[PDB]
Design a binder for this molecule. Sequence first.
Ligand code: F43
Ligand SMILES: C[C@@H](OP(=O)(O)O)[C@H](NC(=O)/C=C/CCCCSSCCS(=O)(=O)O)C(=O)O
Ligand SMILES: [Mg+2]
Ligand SMILES: [Mg+2]
Ligand SMILES: [Mg+2]
Ligand SMILES: [Mg+2]
Ligand SMILES: [Mg+2]
Ligand SMILES: [Mg+2]
Ligand SMILES: [Zn+2]
Lengths: 548, 548, 442, 165, 246
Amino acid sequence: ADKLFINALKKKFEESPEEKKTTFYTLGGWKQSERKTEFVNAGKEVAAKRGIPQYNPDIGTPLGQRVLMPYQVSTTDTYVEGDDLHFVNNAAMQQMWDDIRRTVIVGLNHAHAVIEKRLGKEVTPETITHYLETVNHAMPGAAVVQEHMVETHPALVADSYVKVFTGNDEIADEIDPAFVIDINKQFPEDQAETLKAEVGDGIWQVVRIPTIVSRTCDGATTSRWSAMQIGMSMISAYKQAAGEAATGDFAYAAKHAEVIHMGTYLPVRRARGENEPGGVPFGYLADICQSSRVNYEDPVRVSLDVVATGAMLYDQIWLGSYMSGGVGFTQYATAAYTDNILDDFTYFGKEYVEDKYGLCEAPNNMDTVLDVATEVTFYGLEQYEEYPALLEDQFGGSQRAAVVAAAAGCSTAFATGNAQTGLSGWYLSMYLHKEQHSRLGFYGYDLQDQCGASNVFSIRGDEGLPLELRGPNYPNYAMNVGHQGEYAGISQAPHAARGDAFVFNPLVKIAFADDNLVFDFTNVRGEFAKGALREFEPAGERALITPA
Amino acid sequence: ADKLFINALKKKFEESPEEKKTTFYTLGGWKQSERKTEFVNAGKEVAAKRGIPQYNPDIGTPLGQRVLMPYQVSTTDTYVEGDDLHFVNNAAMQQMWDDIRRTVIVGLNHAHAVIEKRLGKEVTPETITHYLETVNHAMPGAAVVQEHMVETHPALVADSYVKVFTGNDEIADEIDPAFVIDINKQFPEDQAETLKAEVGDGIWQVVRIPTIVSRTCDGATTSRWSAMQIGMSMISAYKQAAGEAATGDFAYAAKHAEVIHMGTYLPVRRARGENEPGGVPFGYLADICQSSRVNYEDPVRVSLDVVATGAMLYDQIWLGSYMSGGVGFTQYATAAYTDNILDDFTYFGKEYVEDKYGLCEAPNNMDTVLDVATEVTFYGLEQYEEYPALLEDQFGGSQRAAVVAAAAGCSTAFATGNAQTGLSGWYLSMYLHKEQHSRLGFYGYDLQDQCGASNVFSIRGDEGLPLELRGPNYPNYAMNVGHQGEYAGISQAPHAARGDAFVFNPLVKIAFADDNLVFDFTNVRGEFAKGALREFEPAGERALITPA
Amino acid sequence: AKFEDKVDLYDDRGNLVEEQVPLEALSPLRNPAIKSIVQGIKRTVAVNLEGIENALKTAKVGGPACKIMGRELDLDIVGNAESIAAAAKEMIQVTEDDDTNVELLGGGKRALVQVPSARFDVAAEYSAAPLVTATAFVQAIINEFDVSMYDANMVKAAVLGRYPQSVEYMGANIATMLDIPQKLEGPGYALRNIMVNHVVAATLKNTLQAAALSTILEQTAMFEMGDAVGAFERMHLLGLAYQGMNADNLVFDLVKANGKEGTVGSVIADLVERALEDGVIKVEKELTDYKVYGTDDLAMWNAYAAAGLMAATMVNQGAARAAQGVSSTLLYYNDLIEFETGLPSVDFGKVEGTAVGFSFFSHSIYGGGGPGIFNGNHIVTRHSKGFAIPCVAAAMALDAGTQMFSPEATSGLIKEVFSQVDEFREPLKYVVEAAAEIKNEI
Amino acid sequence: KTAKVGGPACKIMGRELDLDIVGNAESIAAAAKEMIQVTEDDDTNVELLGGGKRALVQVPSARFDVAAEYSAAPLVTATAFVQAIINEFDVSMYDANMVKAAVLGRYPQSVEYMGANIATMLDIPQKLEGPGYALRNIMVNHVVAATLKNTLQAAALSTILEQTA
Amino acid sequence: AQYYPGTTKVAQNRRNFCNPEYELEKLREISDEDVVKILGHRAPGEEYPSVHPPLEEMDEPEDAIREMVEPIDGAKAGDRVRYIQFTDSMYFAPAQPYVRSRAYLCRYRGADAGTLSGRQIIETRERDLEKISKELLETEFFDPARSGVRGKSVHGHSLRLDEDGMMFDMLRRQIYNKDTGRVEMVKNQIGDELDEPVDLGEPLDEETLMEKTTIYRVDGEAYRDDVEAVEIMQRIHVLRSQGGFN
Ligand code: F43
Ligand SMILES: C[C@@H](OP(=O)(O)O)[C@H](NC(=O)/C=C/CCCCSSCCS(=O)(=O)O)C(=O)O
Ligand SMILES: [Mg+2]
Ligand SMILES: [Mg+2]
Ligand SMILES: [Mg+2]
Ligand SMILES: [Mg+2]
Ligand SMILES: [Mg+2]
Ligand SMILES: [Mg+2]
Ligand SMILES: [Zn+2]
């Protein structure tokens, strides 16, 4: 059958994708593009309004001496200019990040113990449900105890709420389903039994603070905001004195002893608090993406939905804004989630491994890394050499390095069932690719790549870690595009081939199994398309409090 | 003439302001309030649409057993319920913080040295204008060198731009005036001469990145995004190779050697990067406020516009959200910018000082601290005792302590011309107030207050600092409401009485003298009223990219 | 001697040990036992061999609720502890007869490790203790079981956690009384970032020894921070002696006189009587039925008032056998004494201020917690320069079981290992002995 | 003399203090040495350079064997010079905080000693990328300056500090 | 001990509340059962819940300080730590927030007292808390119109009185009976309805409020005219200032 990228290449160019020559310089530059033309017109309107020049197509070099391409968002039939995938222009991408940044998971297990032991009071499904009606009033920023409080406008904060989950079916089934992430409904039966066994009789809150607050403030706000309003709702629903010594144990539990941040804080050169992208480990990113609980019969679809989640967050928002800015890094990321290119390569590798070894049944060793990562690296590279339109599509070496090595590293982990030999296959792919084409990525692309083989299995202080625990703050990974989202995909790959319900943290997996999110985490690439088409509705906007 | 708060007390309550008795419990609770009624209805609508209970006026205790008051925004004739002054419900308050967070000051001094001495090219006003045209295309997120770049939509990022200033009038006048903050146009003559003397022949950029990016990301994004696009524009405008060794000197200059952040980064317990509220020192906050260049005839107006800037940012957004959250701290801050109360107290103290000493005439010593701060403390406290409506208005002791001590500390510094003795008068105020009424503030209000007298003039490592250099990260100040914005007013007070153009950084002062900002920093209290009325138009919205 | 003051030193039963010791013999800069304690605290690590084994067997590594399915490794670490510990020790030591100690506890479920002092004399700071210990145990476990290159990274995760993705050793199965250098609120703060529950657990809840260890650590940090240099030095040394070292048996005798029926106010009255009897304070002025006291020695008044503050904590929270009211004692002992006398309270108001915020952040929704989770580096309790946290240590030593976040809950690993060390457990005894030894060298 | 304290371009008008510190460098240095030392004749060194414009200060080793880390060097130095400057001129209680600012900068509002007029080859412990990294946070130009650009000696000093870390 | 400077009635009342030798005037009689009901921590005839076992059952190591300090009775028993909280009107209630915490730590053993503008709390072991609470409720610490027992929703210290002379209470826990001239407690301190109300007696008339108040006000005795008490506050400020410097 056609390679999976052929439909997209036929849409991009007039030539068939195998054709070797074209013509350039006749398209009228920016005037070929609907989107560029909208930008030129907007630039002139902005500059007049504010009295300062702004976007001008005659500054610098003239874009569009070649075709300015559409991109197919992979797994969709949506084709858009790449500007519609820039995070600034795509409200689904912004919301995906806000939904992560404004979430925290907070236990009720120490809290319920403080109530039974220090206060000497009972906890039951009934007193939990009362507590959850109270905290769902308080959490968006409304009052429960003092007189003369002034509050947030409910409609500005309609995306903030608190749910719970537990492995104890009999407590879960008895609370108002309005408040419960129901593991049995949300997960197929095998995955539900694994998750309920991990959670056991623990009861956990998933707290989402308002998107308008997260945007005004930062990620480190989230666990504090959550704890203030859990603390108020504990006082109101359990009849404490409104501020006694025991109140401090609820605060320490909700802020530190039974909190799970999405991201941990960063070192001073890149200083940031909790719940910022650099603190999110790759294992968590894979668990936030919900493809695993929908697409589990297709480990390649689960893995590549994780790569799309991570490439957009880590490369476009984190590296391309928090850590840089400007035009930024849209197409370093879109290479991993458009034109079905990574999908073609990775489905090739999956078939290779399923035929040769069977999924997860290759030895977990360097012989398997050498076999699978080299075979899938040469397949992907051969496609750029057989299809000159594919090479002109993924025109930057770094894009090609990330895509070919993601397919090689994922397929290696589909063979071994272990992410660490997957990571070794990613690095081997880079070294083979560099020698095949006498280039790899941008000037600084392979800092991690050359440290890479040696640090995969090291045990030393700031070198050794399973891939699932690494993240954007692992030292070698802290700077460069075209790696972090792909590493999240590799972390997912052996778990998806094994049928595991989660990669690194079961609580995180359950916490995003929730259709009350604004972004739909079960279909990340579908959401990116919806945002690109201007059809996604984000939270956080101020229209209600601004003039008509 | 009447005390300046009388009109407001006559608006709030049916009784005359001196009347000791009233009747409660007859107002229908929340039904007395237009805003609570809007909230009840919106909570019903939110909960029905999403399937989770939200705002409910019957959870916890029933607001409005007493009058839910309007508040006059001081210096205005706008009266609003306090919920309209919560930062979540007030787009002017959110934009004030976005305009600070998204600003950096970046010299061109080292950069022009690199171009002359390393690249061997000339800099003149003309080459500076070409560079400014180029950076005003690139800074909002648009390309100047590469082919096939995808860019931000210019209308989503219309608030981002770069201007410059210099103390050389003839050089300022040669650069295109679209790009120039004209010191002589924005500042009265004497202040303009002071500011141009400080800047000299130095040339500085004021860079503002897009509010939509600041909101998506964080304050530590600002100097990075600025430097990326300065770097691209130096490449394009001075014909560099696009990435050569000298490119890294422009990066180190723009990111480190000649950058001025609005805020410095914070320690790990409260981890945050640069350009977050806790890093903004009090002298910079007084400089950001632009009342000094407009209201210079009236040092009380200048000082209390700085107290409003700081009480909102430091107590409502910083302490009440970044550092806690929930319903938060609206009225802890509104006590310092409503009902003309702090104005009444501080005009009294200014007049007392005028008469006894003359502004700036008093000896800079403890005798002056004891005279002025005691006299003004007793004045303020007598007002609450003479007017039962005033005490029921500023019903929390912390609100009263902050307002009386701000008037006492500002008045002391109007006498001495020195903010340190002003600060000692703030602490003495708290000690007198505590013994007068046998109460001060909330449980934790006077941690800094009891450390306070001893640390005013200490010289030890983490104790000794001139008030202008202190901020929300000075150790004793790092936790509690009702101090930080008032300290920014005390830091402004002696400089407004002296007629100094700035309090701590002349670059920061100039950098906000710009009507291209979205918030009008010359009239902070006026803008808070406009936002409360839902009449302020913020930047950053996603309407253009979301469904109609 | 730079100062002429002498003090009498006692044991924790109130018996005299040594009379007329020069004040500087208690200085952290001179006392060799405080040097040993501080170098001990920098170099000692608790290793939880059982916890490493269990984390490997379940693949639960990297922090709370984290687990990597398919990565499980079942290794008989505790049953081979002796061999693992010996192989770790040969990598940890510098030479064979140096001061490295590696000692199994709990049937090999735990190890006390003291990394050799010499590694610290050529280090900038103190992180060599956990980092040298961690790698030596990761390498000794890999070598004991010949763990493969493919699986060894799980041993590293079980020992040291999610570092370096996380800044801290998140999920580690080792523990130290110090915390990482990046968490200091300022430079010079490391000896202050030691949980109060860790000091109470190391001293086995002996009230005087907990207060001594806490004071030694706090006032030694005051030297490192520069606060005790120049004008302030004597004030800090006298605080150390009288509040933490029971100099002249002042704390002890106040507690004895007020323990059966006393309150904070009765302790105050006794301390003001004692300060007058000793000439530390004198009536300066008579107002109407009210004596205004003055002093010609503010450092000594501050020290006497500090001893009274400690005694008041012991009386007040000792009578409740509940630590929470220490925040109230630290506030109202100092508020009452300034209106009782006309003189400044302990640390010139900074204990009272620390106590106002400590009270709020131990009885409110916003942060903090119970007394035992504070420390001198905590934002709420950093403000007094050594005169508040030792009282919190005494109070948690006297708590009979009212805390959820008790030393049993937060500091069990620390208690098993660090209470083994005689100078950490009974510092009052070793510092006073060393002071008596060097008494003629000052 | 200019009230330029607290970091780049910062100034507090009205706070200027005109003190002849360089002309009295010997008395100030000796008074700071007496606070900095532990005992007379220990390994404390305070040496004037550049006719009193600079001082080389080596804080006694003994203060580090009773410290967790290395910040006692700048903190003990800074406070002994702040107190010696105040005592030399009898700076008043009201003005002395400007001496503090001119020495140590905007600390503690800033985490670093931002605008300080003292310098070390080490940087603050908070800036370490990982535990154990302090001997790595020494600028290459500082190594090359201290070794007077002798190629082998700069390579040696850098390797000693790297491999010791 | 001298407690407090000053030559006003307010000063002398501050010293009398602090002085354990001063006999607090008893104004009203309340039964033990009714103190327990107003506290709201346990029901009549419910045994004291424990947070830990009795001290005697613990077998503790030798500690000289523990040996010297006698535990209060509820500490020996292992009782929960519970609280009582009061709000005092700035319209001349007899006790006020710092007066309470200062007095409690001179009068009562084993006490965690907290002061705020709108509420003041003591937490201690439950059986001892019931003994101290009887004294806080039956004596001139308390006026049933100008002071309120309130564990939450404390607003009213700074509010105008209603037409009966009662302080505002969002939850109306104390109701003035026009037919008796007496106040009844109708709810416990957290706001739950009592089965039967508790007699709290008659509010103090204005003369006796003025005699017994510890707040300074322009319309009572002004603090600025108690020049000796201001002098000691100012002294404190100046001495802490100079001590912090050198
Ligand atoms: C539960 C606490 C203890 C705690 O840690 N925080 C609370 C409650 C918290 C909640 C109350 C929201 C709610 O009702 O659900 C919030 C808004 C913080 C948040 N979580 O959003 C808050 N306080 Ni409080 N808190 C305030 C105040 C106060 C004053 C109120 C005295 C009075 O007589 O009314 C007193 C402290 C004092 O006595 O000085 C106070 C206490 C308390 N404060 C007592 C509850 C008091 C009561 O039972 O009624 N606050 C104030 O004094 C004014 C500003 C006000 C803050 C809201 C705003 O700034 O708009 C609010 C700030
Ligand atoms: C103290 C510390 O919290 P931690 O102990 O959990 O680290 C720190 N939190 C804070 O400093 C909290 C400051 C903001 C909230 C308190 C401001 S005082 S205004 C409320 C008074 S009252 O209305 O409740 O009486 C943090 O880093 O989160
Ligand atoms: Mg949906
Ligand atoms: Mg949808
Ligand atoms: Mg007069
Ligand atoms: Mg305008
Ligand atoms: Mg007499
Ligand atoms: Mg009776
Ligand atoms: Zn943001």
